[PDB]
Structures are given as structure tokens and as C-alpha cells.
Amino acid sequence: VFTTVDNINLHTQVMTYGQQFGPTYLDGADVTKIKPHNSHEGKTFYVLPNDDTLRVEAFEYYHTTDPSFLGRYMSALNHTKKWKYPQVNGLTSIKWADNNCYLATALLTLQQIELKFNPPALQDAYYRARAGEAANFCALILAYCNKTVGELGDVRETMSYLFQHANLDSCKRVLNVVCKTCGQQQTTLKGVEAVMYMGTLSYEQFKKGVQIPCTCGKQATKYLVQQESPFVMMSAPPAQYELKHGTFTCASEYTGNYQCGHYKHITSKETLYCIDGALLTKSSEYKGPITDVFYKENSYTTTIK
Ligand SMILES: C=CC(=O)Nc1ccc(C)c(C(=O)N[C@H](C)c2cccc3ccccc23)c1
Ligand SMILES: [Cl-]
Ligand SMILES: [Cl-]
Ligand SMILES: [Cl-]
Ligand SMILES: [Cl-]
Ligand SMILES: [Zn+2]
Ligand SMILES: [Zn+2]
Ligand SMILES: [Zn+2]
Ligand SMILES: [Zn+2]
């Protein structure tokens, strides 16, 4: 048979699996204690890294040394394999199961923004997800986010974790802070901090300025001087918000109470589409509880001296 950690580098091997190889998985399902059948023969098994060659191969494919990672990934995959991934409005969604609404919203969002994942495991799975086969990609999202199946998930926290595994180095955000007393200070943010803001949904309002505390004691004004990124994510606690066709890429709708409510996805095409897992409605106007709005960007410089 063949052992692997990445399903690229295959090593030939020939008493339980757990005694010979340590924790040994097949197609999601733990076969550590279980024995070697005759149709459990010739195929490819995943193993926990137990020698240097496999640790290096594991880090090179996943970008983590965390020894739980593989087990958390296989426990997720055992469920995500059984979910349905229908095409909805030319996007791979997920049918509702095991509290996955937040994952579906993230997955739909990731198909509409420009992102390169550093870990080969994630990039490969992203491409396969975009082409309709998203089980692997969803298991990896759960593992990288330290979330298990059924656990209550936040889209902003999931996007934040995923962004930290993505090539956002070229992304730059210059902010000016204007206080009556302390005066003007400019800050350069890079990477994840350049593409994410919590406090308002409106990219327009971020450019025009928002009111934040100053250390001195007063209320100051933060405004956007310069943005170099393919997109920005604007987030705020759920609040009734109007979404206008053509002024945003997509948005997370969040209904109900902290943690135990539900997400739906709004996307701006030729009209506004609402994706609720397998279900698709459309309308020209939208007002509802929004918590995330994604916008297109390349290069922005303010006309405020
Ligand atoms: C840190 C621990 C944690 O478990 N976080 C987490 C996990 C899972 C979920 C669904 C949420 C969450 O309900 N997020 C929504 C969008 C939300 C965000 C911020 C402020 C809010 C105010 C009122 C209602 C919703 C609010 C947060
Ligand atoms: Cl890394
Ligand atoms: Cl299941
Ligand atoms: Cl759900
Ligand atoms: Cl990474
Ligand atoms: Zn990395
Ligand atoms: Zn399940
Ligand atoms: Zn849900
Ligand atoms: Zn001040």
C-alpha cells in the first residue's frame, strides 16, 4: 500500500495499521485500531507524520507543524464529504447541515474576491471547490480555524483566519487620525489589517471619516488616505442596512441572537441575489441585517489634504 501526508508524495509500505504506522486514516474514517483487509490493499492511506521526511512534507503542504491538525482535518472531512454542494447562480454553495451556514457564506464570498493561499493544501482545495468539489476545502477551513463540525461560526473570524494564510503582503492601508488637541497622526497597516475594518459597513463612510476614541480622552476622526488591495471587507455588529445593486461585491446577512443565529449571502450581479444554502431569491432592492460587505479595490488615494 501507499502512505502519504499530502496525497502528492506516496511512500510504498506493507498487526493493525496503528501498531505499524501510528494513527492511519482512509478517505476520512480513522482505521488506527482496525486491521488490513484485502480491498484495503494497493490504495493510499494518510498517516500522522512519524519521521522527518513526513514532518517536512506535512509543513510544505499545510504550513503547520500542529500534530492535531491532521486529525482535526480528517474529523471535519468525515462530515463535509456528506454535505451537498449545489451550483447556485454560478457559485458553489452548501446545503444547510451541522450549523454550516457561516461556511457556505465564507465559501460563496471566497469565489468572488481575489486571494492566493500560501499553503499548497488550501490553494489546491480552493481551485477544486470553485469547480464544484468543495468537501476538502470546507474540512481544511474548519481545521485552520480551530473549529469542529456543528460549532457556531462567525464569517468575519473565518475570513480573518483564512486571510492570515493568504498572500496579502502587497496590501497597504494608510489612515490619518485627526484630533482637536493631539493633532494628525498617519499609520501604515499591511496584510490582513489593511483589508479588514470593524465598526462600519460603508467603504464610502470610511473614506469620508468615522468617529473613534483618542487616547487623550476626546473623539477623533479616522479616514482612509490610501488603499492598495484587490478588495476590502467592512464589518459591523448586525444592523438594518440598504444594499444597492452595483455599489458592493457581496455581503453576509446575519439573523437572530449572538452565536446561535443564521447567515445568508447577498451578491450583486445584474440584480441582487440572496443565497440561503441551496435556495436562491432575487430582488432589485435589499434592506436587512448586514454584518459584512465586500468591495472591489485596486489603488485608492483620497482628495483630502
Ligand atoms: C468570540 C467568540 C465567538 O464565539 N464569536 C462568534 C461566534 C459565532 C457567531 C455566530 C458570532 C456572531 O454571532 N457574530 C455576529 C455576526 C455578531 C458579531 C458581532 C457582534 C454581534 C452583536 C449581536 C449579534 C451578532 C453579532 C460570534
Ligand atoms: Cl507558515
Ligand atoms: Cl455526517
Ligand atoms: Cl445551519
Ligand atoms: Cl500560511
Ligand atoms: Zn504559511
Ligand atoms: Zn455531520
Ligand atoms: Zn446556521
Ligand atoms: Zn488627542
Author numbering: 7 to 20, 25 to 315
Provide the authors' original text about this structure.
There are two distinctive cysteine proteases encoded by the SARS-CoV-2 genome that are essential to the virus proliferation cycle: papain-like protease (PLpro, a domain within Nsp3, EC 3.4.22.46) and chymotrypsin-like main protease (3CLpro or Mpro, corresponding to Nsp5, EC 3.4.22.69). Nevertheless, PLpro is a multifunctional protein having an essential role in processing of viral polyproteins, maturation, and assembly of the RTC, and it also may act on the host cell proteins by disrupting host viral response machinery to facilitate viral proliferation and replication. Briefly, the protein has two distinct domains: the small N-terminal ubiquitin-like (Ubl) domain and the “thumb–palm–fingers” catalytic domain. The palm subdomain is comprised of six β-strands with the catalytic residues Cys111, His272, and Asp286 located at the interface between the thumb and palm subdomains.
Compound 3 is a derivative of 1, in which its amino moiety is functionalized to become an acrylamide. The structure with compound 3 was solved in both wild-type and mutant forms. The structures of protein, the pose, and overall interactions of the inhibitor are the same in both variants. The structures of complexes with inhibitors 1, 2, and 3 were determined at 1.95–2.30 Å, including compound 3 in both wild-type and mutant forms. Structural comparison shows that only some interactions are preserved—all hydrophobic interactions and one hydrogen bond. The acrylamide moiety in 3 provides two additional hydrogen bonds as compared to 1. All three ligands bind to the same site in the enzyme located 8–10 Å away from the catalytic cysteine and it is expected that all seven synthetic compounds bind in a very similar manner. Considerable conformational adjustments are observed for the side chains of residues involved in ligand binding. These inhibitors bind to protease S4/S3 sites. In the structures with inhibitors there are additional zinc and chloride ions bound, including one in the active site that is coordinated by the active site Cys111. Moreover, compounds 2 and 3 are quite good PLpro inhibitors (IC50 values of 5.1 and 6.4 μM, respectively), but failed in the viral replication assay.
